[PDB]
Amino acid sequence: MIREERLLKVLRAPHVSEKASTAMEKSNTIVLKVAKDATKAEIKAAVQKLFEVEVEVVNTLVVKGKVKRHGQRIGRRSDWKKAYVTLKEGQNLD
Amino acid sequence: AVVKCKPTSPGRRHVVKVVNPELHKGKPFAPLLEKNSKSGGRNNNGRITTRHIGGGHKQAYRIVDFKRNKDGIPAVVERLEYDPNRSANIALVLYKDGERRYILAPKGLKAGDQIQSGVDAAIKPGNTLPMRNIPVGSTVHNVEMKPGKGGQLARSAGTYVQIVARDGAYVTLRLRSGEMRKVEADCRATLGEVGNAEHMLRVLGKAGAARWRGVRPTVRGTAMNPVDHPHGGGEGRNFGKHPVTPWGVQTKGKKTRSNKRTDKFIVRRRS
Amino acid sequence: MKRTFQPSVLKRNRSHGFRARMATKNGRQVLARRRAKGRARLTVSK
Amino acid sequence: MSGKMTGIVKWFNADKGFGFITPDDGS
RNA sequence: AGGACCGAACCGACUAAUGUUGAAAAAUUAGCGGAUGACUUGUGGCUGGGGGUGAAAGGCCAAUCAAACCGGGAGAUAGCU
RNA sequence: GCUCGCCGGAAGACCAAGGGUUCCUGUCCAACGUUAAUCGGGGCAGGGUGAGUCGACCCCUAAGGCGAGGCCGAAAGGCGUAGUCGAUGGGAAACAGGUUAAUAUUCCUGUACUUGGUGUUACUGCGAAGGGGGGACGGAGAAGGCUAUGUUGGCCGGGCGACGGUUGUCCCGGUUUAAGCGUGUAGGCUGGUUUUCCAGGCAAAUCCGGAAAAUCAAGGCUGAGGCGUGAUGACGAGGCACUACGGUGCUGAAGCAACAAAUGCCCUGCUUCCAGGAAAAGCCUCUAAGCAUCAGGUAACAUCAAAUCGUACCCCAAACCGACACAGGUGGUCAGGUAGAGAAUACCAAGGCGCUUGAGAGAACUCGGGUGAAGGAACUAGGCAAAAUGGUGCCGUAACUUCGGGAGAAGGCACGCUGAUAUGUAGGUGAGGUCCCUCGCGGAUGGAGCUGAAAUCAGUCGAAGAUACCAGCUGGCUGCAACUGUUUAUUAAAAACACAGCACUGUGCAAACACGAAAGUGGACGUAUACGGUGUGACGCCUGCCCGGUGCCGGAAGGUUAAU
Ligand SMILES: [Mg+2]
Ligand SMILES: [Mg+2]
Ligand SMILES: [Mg+2]
Ligand SMILES: [Mg+2]
Ligand SMILES: [Mg+2]
Ligand SMILES: [Mg+2]
Ligand SMILES: [Mg+2]
Ligand SMILES: [Mg+2]
Ligand SMILES: [Mg+2]
Ligand SMILES: [Mg+2]
Ligand SMILES: [Mg+2]
Ligand SMILES: [Mg+2]
Ligand SMILES: [Mg+2]
Ligand SMILES: [Mg+2]
Ligand SMILES: [Mg+2]
Ligand SMILES: [Mg+2]
Ligand SMILES: [Mg+2]
Ligand SMILES: [Mg+2]
Ligand SMILES: [Mg+2]
Ligand SMILES: [Mg+2]
Ligand SMILES: [Mg+2]
Ligand SMILES: [Mg+2]
Ligand SMILES: [Mg+2]
Ligand SMILES: [Mg+2]
Ligand SMILES: [Mg+2]
Ligand SMILES: [Mg+2]
Ligand SMILES: [Mg+2]
Ligand SMILES: [Mg+2]
Ligand SMILES: [Mg+2]
Ligand SMILES: [Mg+2]
Ligand SMILES: [Mg+2]
Ligand SMILES: [Mg+2]
Ligand SMILES: [Mg+2]
Ligand SMILES: [Mg+2]
Ligand SMILES: [Mg+2]
Ligand SMILES: [Mg+2]
Ligand SMILES: [Mg+2]
Ligand SMILES: [Mg+2]
Ligand SMILES: [Mg+2]
Ligand SMILES: [Mg+2]
Ligand SMILES: [Mg+2]
Ligand SMILES: [Mg+2]
Ligand SMILES: [Mg+2]
Ligand SMILES: [Mg+2]
Ligand SMILES: [Mg+2]
Ligand SMILES: [Mg+2]
Ligand SMILES: [Mg+2]
Ligand SMILES: [Mg+2]
Ligand SMILES: [Mg+2]
Ligand SMILES: [Mg+2]
Ligand SMILES: [Mg+2]
Ligand SMILES: [Mg+2]
Ligand SMILES: [Mg+2]
Ligand SMILES: [Mg+2]
Ligand SMILES: [Mg+2]
Ligand SMILES: [Mg+2]
Ligand SMILES: [Mg+2]
Ligand SMILES: [Mg+2]
Ligand SMILES: [Mg+2]
Ligand SMILES: [Mg+2]
Ligand SMILES: [Mg+2]
Ligand SMILES: [Mg+2]
Ligand SMILES: [Mg+2]
Ligand SMILES: [Mg+2]
Ligand SMILES: [Mg+2]
Ligand SMILES: [Mg+2]
Ligand SMILES: [Mg+2]
């Protein structure tokens, strides 16, 4: 059992998108921005405890950060991690 | 059997094959094989120590009994095989207790003969017994220099050594080079000449047949520049100097033996 | 024509990388020179 | 705009493109 | 069968023209040689500078080689401009 | 949007390497883009990469690297044992369909599969850092069996023709379907089985190997493809409807056969040759100490787990290496039609492009080409360059020769189309049908149907029938080098180098020699029929005289002669 403090530090934010709204309405799948070191079991435990909802499976991907230029000085945004969390049928989430 | 090839192409114009139909047309005995990785004539420093070596066909090593320690136990000869590692053919023998080994094939040896090492061995071509038990005047091969070290003399395709004398602990040998050498009388030796005597009767015909054998081409020294070789240079073909190595050592005639440890074992030099 | 730089990250890092510099004595003196000069990229290694 | 590399080492001549337009007549 | 033959891929580079502040710091076009072999190619590895390697042209060793490159002795010396 | 043109063994598609957001959408046009730009791989903002089966990671090792101790070395450090790294190679498993502006073998639907776990039940010799097997391997060649795929017919749907004709021997399109599971085929290999014994495999062994004896000829292993299922499904031309004209929803016919056929598969096969063709683990098995009724073992079932990283995009290129949006370079995979020997070449399909300045004019001159009176190398250093020859089949073919060649010598004839032989032949394929059977993916017979050269004869057209592209100029004398090869990346491809061969000479093994202050290593896990060096350079006839000089070898009586 993963401890609740880590499970509270795993999830960062929900990801709003046209693809996220599509997966939410068709496959009943939410799209989350998670901590970068978070694994699939930590995500499934966090969603099953902090949201009280039944998780079927978790797919993850790492988003590479973009290279931006503030004025003319170059810079690079952070790599962040994205999770497609497929809920079981009948389950609902805000 | 030497076979002159018909000149259907240059490179087949001058080829003489050495065809032996008794050799096994199959894979060798797998437990007695091991890997033989090529070197290119390069040492652990990566530098070329001996030149003109490189390339050639991949070769597996055949573990050959030179020490020949299975005393008393007779062995029948199973089949004759090709060895790429050496000029002589090898014989796969089967001892009575179920052990298989490779030996050097003697001249008249064929599949089905019986051999036996040891002191009580008979005197026929193939047996291995100490030279205090071997009669003076016989031709032996696979000769040890030290007892139990393994045979080191007369291993090439057609060689043999005569036993010309014996004075107690030593026997005197007539090596194939003509040198007369003392060896302890407890060293093992194997009766008869080594097999493939017509190996030297082959002609490679073309350059690729040496590149198959890993012999890179030899650039003669006067075709170079003086920075490369002492012979190099000239505004034409000029060689107004004594023949030397690439390192300036006389080659035509100059002796190079500097072993004062083994001079007591040398009766007469070659000549 | 075939030019002299044909990149390969494995060969780049095995030849000029950090561990290859830290392996030998003279390579460690290279990293000490670049730190004294204040290099941002101390080696090839990303 | 970051427009260097114009006359830096004039590699223009570091090219040192073969001269001696086959004129060894001046010997 | 063949370091066999003709001939694409592929490797090479014999001739001519163009181009020569080029399309290109050696190429294009039309022809050309080898093309189952001493072939060619991918990846990785090894050999280090008076040293390597070299089917040997003083060839090649990062567009640099009758002794690489970088830093240092070093503001070498220069009866020379 | 309609036409035109180009590639099409690529100028199409998929990747690796490499790059690293160039991907998609909205918006902008200052700069960049060799012009303008509303456009963009440009600026700005947002979005986008979903895996138990793909790959990496991981297990395993090669070359090689590092290297506890160790040996060696002024120091630094060098080499290297046990080990440990190191892929480019070995090792478990997923397919089809659908969908997004952008991902999919990753999502969804369907149908599977693998390896580990724990826990049940039955059964009961388990056990390795060790032994054995296997993994496990070359080149070339020959067919045979297939499939991918294509063509034609049938079938279904639609059409009846802008200009003569077109209800037909007419036109267009479609006719797709996987992994898996079952079957074990063409075909390849192999003698099986039982018992006894045994100086071997470091000890052991029931394993392997080897001796015996008896019995049975017929069992086993491997194995493309096919067939069945998967699949009453999915897909599907089209319709039916809404329609932001983009699309979304619903419905949905036929979905067969023959022939040809690979460079792909059986094939890691078979035959054959000499130059004699990785390793280790996984896997199978054997026992050792040990464990003694416990552990563990396999068999079924249930359940759980299969993490992490990559996944966008270009990838013969405007995104990589070339300073450029550079006519260069870059490894793997796929390989449609007609003609054709062909992956050449010509025209096309799928698909992708028209190469980021145009518009005129129609001078000299230059570039790349076309044709040319008469002559035909008179040009020129020189037939440089051009032009010409060019295919298949048959006839025929010299000197010389190492008897192989020369030789495609040279030179010449035929070549289209239509009809007949024969409404399409020989040949190939092979059905129905019938018979037999140890019964099946069977064996005969049988010839339907399909496919289909080549030849002769007759006729006919044109100036011309290898009609285009493609595609040898030939011969004579002679120098050099035997040949194939190699070489001055970037002015020299040659008579230069190499070569097989020959000779001399050194070398007896802790070999000579070479790299190394050394240890060591190569030579070589080789042993004088071997290795090194030197010169010559196939083959044929040959290789003559000189040892005075310079070298080298041998000598050791005398002279001279160092340190001491
Ligand atoms: Mg999933
Ligand atoms: Mg992933
Ligand atoms: Mg040599
Ligand atoms: Mg030679
Ligand atoms: Mg030579
Ligand atoms: Mg020269
Ligand atoms: Mg010299
Ligand atoms: Mg001269
Ligand atoms: Mg002279
Ligand atoms: Mg050839
Ligand atoms: Mg050819
Ligand atoms: Mg060309
Ligand atoms: Mg010179
Ligand atoms: Mg250079
Ligand atoms: Mg130097
Ligand atoms: Mg110097
Ligand atoms: Mg000074
Ligand atoms: Mg100065
Ligand atoms: Mg258009
Ligand atoms: Mg075209
Ligand atoms: Mg950008
Ligand atoms: Mg775009
Ligand atoms: Mg845009
Ligand atoms: Mg404007
Ligand atoms: Mg502009
Ligand atoms: Mg942009
Ligand atoms: Mg190693
Ligand atoms: Mg070491
Ligand atoms: Mg140590
Ligand atoms: Mg390992
Ligand atoms: Mg690999
Ligand atoms: Mg692996
Ligand atoms: Mg895409
Ligand atoms: Mg084994
Ligand atoms: Mg092979
Ligand atoms: Mg078929
Ligand atoms: Mg009409
Ligand atoms: Mg009409
Ligand atoms: Mg049709
Ligand atoms: Mg099936
Ligand atoms: Mg992709
Ligand atoms: Mg492309
Ligand atoms: Mg452009
Ligand atoms: Mg380009
Ligand atoms: Mg074609
Ligand atoms: Mg083509
Ligand atoms: Mg004009
Ligand atoms: Mg013309
Ligand atoms: Mg004329
Ligand atoms: Mg005329
Ligand atoms: Mg004239
Ligand atoms: Mg004249
Ligand atoms: Mg010409
Ligand atoms: Mg022409
Ligand atoms: Mg006819
Ligand atoms: Mg003359
Ligand atoms: Mg020649
Ligand atoms: Mg040639
Ligand atoms: Mg070259
Ligand atoms: Mg040149
Ligand atoms: Mg040239
Ligand atoms: Mg040694
Ligand atoms: Mg010569
Ligand atoms: Mg002479
Ligand atoms: Mg003399
Ligand atoms: Mg002397
Ligand atoms: Mg003296």
mmCIF file of N, CA and C (backbone and C1' of nucleotides) in Angstrom, chain F residues 418-441:
data_model
loop_
_atom_site.group_PDB
_atom_site.id
_atom_site.type_symbol
_atom_site.label_atom_id
_atom_site.label_comp_id
_atom_site.label_asym_id
_atom_site.label_seq_id
_atom_site.Cartn_x
_atom_site.Cartn_y
_atom_site.Cartn_z
ATOM 1 P P U F 418 -1.517 -10.271 -86.464
ATOM 2 O "O5'" U F 418 -2.369 -10.837 -87.678
ATOM 3 C "C5'" U F 418 -3.467 -10.098 -88.181
ATOM 4 C "C4'" U F 418 -3.977 -10.665 -89.480
ATOM 5 C "C3'" U F 418 -4.256 -12.153 -89.470
ATOM 6 O "O3'" U F 418 -5.483 -12.493 -88.862
ATOM 7 C "C1'" U F 418 -3.092 -11.587 -91.433
ATOM 8 P P G F 419 -5.599 -13.866 -88.044
ATOM 9 O "O5'" G F 419 -5.710 -14.991 -89.160
ATOM 10 C "C5'" G F 419 -6.816 -15.032 -90.038
ATOM 11 C "C4'" G F 419 -6.554 -15.919 -91.223
ATOM 12 C "C3'" G F 419 -6.235 -17.367 -90.920
ATOM 13 O "O3'" G F 419 -7.381 -18.132 -90.605
ATOM 14 C "C1'" G F 419 -4.736 -16.557 -92.530
ATOM 15 P P A F 420 -7.275 -19.330 -89.545
ATOM 16 O "O5'" A F 420 -6.588 -20.512 -90.358
ATOM 17 C "C5'" A F 420 -7.206 -21.037 -91.520
ATOM 18 C "C4'" A F 420 -6.257 -21.883 -92.326
ATOM 19 C "C3'" A F 420 -5.617 -23.040 -91.588
ATOM 20 O "O3'" A F 420 -6.454 -24.168 -91.479
ATOM 21 C "C1'" A F 420 -3.968 -21.889 -92.791
ATOM 22 P P U F 421 -6.583 -24.926 -90.079
ATOM 23 O "O5'" U F 421 -5.316 -25.882 -90.098
ATOM 24 C "C5'" U F 421 -5.071 -26.728 -91.206
ATOM 25 C "C4'" U F 421 -3.622 -27.123 -91.291
ATOM 26 C "C3'" U F 421 -3.051 -27.757 -90.043
ATOM 27 O "O3'" U F 421 -3.405 -29.118 -89.928
ATOM 28 C "C1'" U F 421 -1.523 -26.173 -90.919
ATOM 29 P P A F 422 -3.793 -29.726 -88.498
ATOM 30 O "O5'" A F 422 -4.839 -28.673 -87.921
ATOM 31 C "C5'" A F 422 -5.531 -28.917 -86.702
ATOM 32 C "C4'" A F 422 -5.604 -27.688 -85.833
ATOM 33 C "C3'" A F 422 -6.141 -26.434 -86.512
ATOM 34 O "O3'" A F 422 -6.902 -25.676 -85.576
ATOM 35 C "C1'" A F 422 -3.967 -26.023 -85.707
ATOM 36 P P U F 423 -8.431 -26.064 -85.278
ATOM 37 O "O5'" U F 423 -9.215 -24.686 -85.411
ATOM 38 C "C5'" U F 423 -8.872 -23.749 -86.418
ATOM 39 C "C4'" U F 423 -9.630 -22.458 -86.253
ATOM 40 C "C3'" U F 423 -9.450 -21.750 -84.921
ATOM 41 O "O3'" U F 423 -8.280 -20.955 -84.877
ATOM 42 C "C1'" U F 423 -11.749 -21.854 -85.457
ATOM 43 P P G F 424 -7.669 -20.495 -83.467
ATOM 44 O "O5'" G F 424 -6.249 -21.206 -83.440
ATOM 45 C "C5'" G F 424 -6.156 -22.622 -83.377
ATOM 46 C "C4'" G F 424 -5.089 -23.080 -82.424
ATOM 47 C "C3'" G F 424 -5.581 -23.925 -81.258
ATOM 48 O "O3'" G F 424 -4.518 -24.758 -80.815
ATOM 49 C "C1'" G F 424 -4.670 -21.946 -80.421
ATOM 50 P P U F 425 -4.837 -26.110 -80.022
ATOM 51 O "O5'" U F 425 -3.711 -27.093 -80.550
ATOM 52 C "C5'" U F 425 -3.706 -27.487 -81.910
ATOM 53 C "C4'" U F 425 -2.310 -27.746 -82.408
ATOM 54 C "C3'" U F 425 -1.354 -28.290 -81.366
ATOM 55 O "O3'" U F 425 -1.503 -29.684 -81.168
ATOM 56 C "C1'" U F 425 -0.310 -26.554 -82.569
ATOM 57 P P A F 426 -1.431 -30.315 -79.694
ATOM 58 O "O5'" A F 426 0.124 -30.480 -79.412
ATOM 59 C "C5'" A F 426 0.941 -31.170 -80.337
ATOM 60 C "C4'" A F 426 2.406 -30.886 -80.124
ATOM 61 C "C3'" A F 426 2.912 -31.011 -78.699
ATOM 62 O "O3'" A F 426 3.136 -32.356 -78.316
ATOM 63 C "C1'" A F 426 3.719 -29.013 -79.630
ATOM 64 P P G F 427 2.497 -32.908 -76.953
ATOM 65 O "O5'" G F 427 3.108 -31.935 -75.858
ATOM 66 C "C5'" G F 427 4.491 -31.993 -75.551
ATOM 67 C "C4'" G F 427 4.958 -30.746 -74.847
ATOM 68 C "C3'" G F 427 4.388 -30.539 -73.462
ATOM 69 O "O3'" G F 427 4.979 -31.357 -72.475
ATOM 70 C "C1'" G F 427 4.287 -28.521 -74.652
ATOM 71 P P G F 428 4.048 -31.997 -71.337
ATOM 72 O "O5'" G F 428 3.696 -30.770 -70.393
ATOM 73 C "C5'" G F 428 4.717 -30.079 -69.697
ATOM 74 C "C4'" G F 428 4.229 -28.756 -69.170
ATOM 75 C "C3'" G F 428 3.123 -28.846 -68.143
ATOM 76 O "O3'" G F 428 3.605 -29.226 -66.871
ATOM 77 C "C1'" G F 428 2.630 -27.144 -69.690
ATOM 78 P P U F 429 2.854 -30.372 -66.041
ATOM 79 O "O5'" U F 429 1.534 -29.665 -65.522
ATOM 80 C "C5'" U F 429 1.627 -28.496 -64.732
ATOM 81 C "C4'" U F 429 0.339 -27.723 -64.719
ATOM 82 C "C3'" U F 429 -0.847 -28.490 -64.180
ATOM 83 O "O3'" U F 429 -0.841 -28.547 -62.771
ATOM 84 C "C1'" U F 429 -1.480 -27.306 -66.112
ATOM 85 P P G F 430 -0.753 -29.967 -62.043
ATOM 86 O "O5'" G F 430 -2.243 -30.494 -62.147
ATOM 87 C "C5'" G F 430 -3.303 -29.717 -61.629
ATOM 88 C "C4'" G F 430 -4.566 -29.924 -62.415
ATOM 89 C "C3'" G F 430 -5.090 -31.346 -62.423
ATOM 90 O "O3'" G F 430 -5.784 -31.707 -61.242
ATOM 91 C "C1'" G F 430 -5.110 -30.492 -64.614
ATOM 92 P P A F 431 -6.802 -32.945 -61.270
ATOM 93 O "O5'" A F 431 -8.222 -32.297 -61.572
ATOM 94 C "C5'" A F 431 -8.759 -31.273 -60.748
ATOM 95 C "C4'" A F 431 -10.163 -30.946 -61.179
ATOM 96 C "C3'" A F 431 -11.072 -32.158 -61.222
ATOM 97 O "O3'" A F 431 -11.621 -32.526 -59.967
ATOM 98 C "C1'" A F 431 -11.298 -30.909 -63.219
ATOM 99 P P G F 432 -12.170 -34.026 -59.751
ATOM 100 O "O5'" G F 432 -13.677 -34.105 -60.257
ATOM 101 C "C5'" G F 432 -14.573 -33.017 -60.236
ATOM 102 C "C4'" G F 432 -15.499 -33.098 -61.425
ATOM 103 C "C3'" G F 432 -16.187 -34.438 -61.654
ATOM 104 O "O3'" G F 432 -17.312 -34.674 -60.834
ATOM 105 C "C1'" G F 432 -15.275 -33.714 -63.678
ATOM 106 P P G F 433 -17.308 -35.906 -59.809
ATOM 107 O "O5'" G F 433 -17.327 -37.155 -60.796
ATOM 108 C "C5'" G F 433 -18.365 -37.267 -61.757
ATOM 109 C "C4'" G F 433 -18.010 -38.197 -62.891
ATOM 110 C "C3'" G F 433 -17.556 -39.589 -62.501
ATOM 111 O "O3'" G F 433 -18.634 -40.430 -62.150
ATOM 112 C "C1'" G F 433 -16.104 -38.750 -64.131
ATOM 113 P P U F 434 -18.644 -41.170 -60.733
ATOM 114 O "O5'" U F 434 -17.824 -42.496 -61.047
ATOM 115 C "C5'" U F 434 -18.208 -43.324 -62.137
ATOM 116 C "C4'" U F 434 -17.066 -44.161 -62.644
ATOM 117 C "C3'" U F 434 -16.356 -44.962 -61.575
ATOM 118 O "O3'" U F 434 -17.065 -46.116 -61.176
ATOM 119 C "C1'" U F 434 -14.766 -43.981 -63.002
ATOM 120 P P C F 435 -17.011 -46.589 -59.645
ATOM 121 O "O5'" C F 435 -15.623 -47.355 -59.547
ATOM 122 C "C5'" C F 435 -15.346 -48.460 -60.387
ATOM 123 C "C4'" C F 435 -13.874 -48.769 -60.413
ATOM 124 C "C3'" C F 435 -13.276 -49.083 -59.056
ATOM 125 O "O3'" C F 435 -13.542 -50.401 -58.634
ATOM 126 C "C1'" C F 435 -11.871 -47.581 -60.195
ATOM 127 P P C F 436 -13.763 -50.708 -57.078
ATOM 128 O "O5'" C F 436 -12.301 -50.592 -56.463
ATOM 129 C "C5'" C F 436 -11.292 -51.497 -56.872
ATOM 130 C "C4'" C F 436 -9.914 -51.061 -56.450
ATOM 131 C "C3'" C F 436 -9.734 -50.920 -54.953
ATOM 132 O "O3'" C F 436 -9.513 -52.167 -54.330
ATOM 133 C "C1'" C F 436 -8.772 -49.056 -56.040
ATOM 134 P P C F 437 -10.112 -52.451 -52.872
ATOM 135 O "O5'" C F 437 -9.167 -51.579 -51.941
ATOM 136 C "C5'" C F 437 -7.787 -51.881 -51.842
ATOM 137 C "C4'" C F 437 -7.025 -50.739 -51.231
ATOM 138 C "C3'" C F 437 -7.464 -50.347 -49.829
ATOM 139 O "O3'" C F 437 -6.895 -51.143 -48.814
ATOM 140 C "C1'" C F 437 -7.191 -48.413 -51.149
ATOM 141 P P U F 438 -7.824 -51.889 -47.743
ATOM 142 O "O5'" U F 438 -7.057 -51.655 -46.371
ATOM 143 C "C5'" U F 438 -6.722 -50.335 -45.967
ATOM 144 C "C4'" U F 438 -5.465 -50.285 -45.138
ATOM 145 C "C3'" U F 438 -5.071 -48.912 -44.616
ATOM 146 O "O3'" U F 438 -5.801 -48.559 -43.453
ATOM 147 C "C1'" U F 438 -3.172 -49.995 -45.522
ATOM 148 P P C F 439 -6.157 -47.026 -43.128
ATOM 149 O "O5'" C F 439 -7.731 -46.937 -43.335
ATOM 150 C "C5'" C F 439 -8.436 -45.755 -42.996
ATOM 151 C "C4'" C F 439 -8.229 -44.695 -44.044
ATOM 152 C "C3'" C F 439 -9.184 -43.519 -44.046
ATOM 153 O "O3'" C F 439 -8.846 -42.564 -43.055
ATOM 154 C "C1'" C F 439 -8.815 -44.304 -46.268
ATOM 155 P P G F 440 -9.548 -41.120 -42.984
ATOM 156 O "O5'" G F 440 -8.626 -40.132 -43.827
ATOM 157 C "C5'" G F 440 -7.345 -39.749 -43.352
ATOM 158 C "C4'" G F 440 -6.515 -39.165 -44.465
ATOM 159 C "C3'" G F 440 -7.087 -37.909 -45.101
ATOM 160 O "O3'" G F 440 -6.849 -36.720 -44.371
ATOM 161 C "C1'" G F 440 -6.431 -39.408 -46.790
ATOM 162 P P C F 441 -7.624 -35.384 -44.807
ATOM 163 O "O5'" C F 441 -6.644 -34.692 -45.854
ATOM 164 C "C5'" C F 441 -7.162 -34.050 -47.014
ATOM 165 C "C4'" C F 441 -6.063 -33.678 -47.974
ATOM 166 C "C3'" C F 441 -5.119 -34.820 -48.325
ATOM 167 O "O3'" C F 441 -4.747 -34.742 -49.697
ATOM 168 C "C1'" C F 441 -3.892 -33.014 -47.422
#
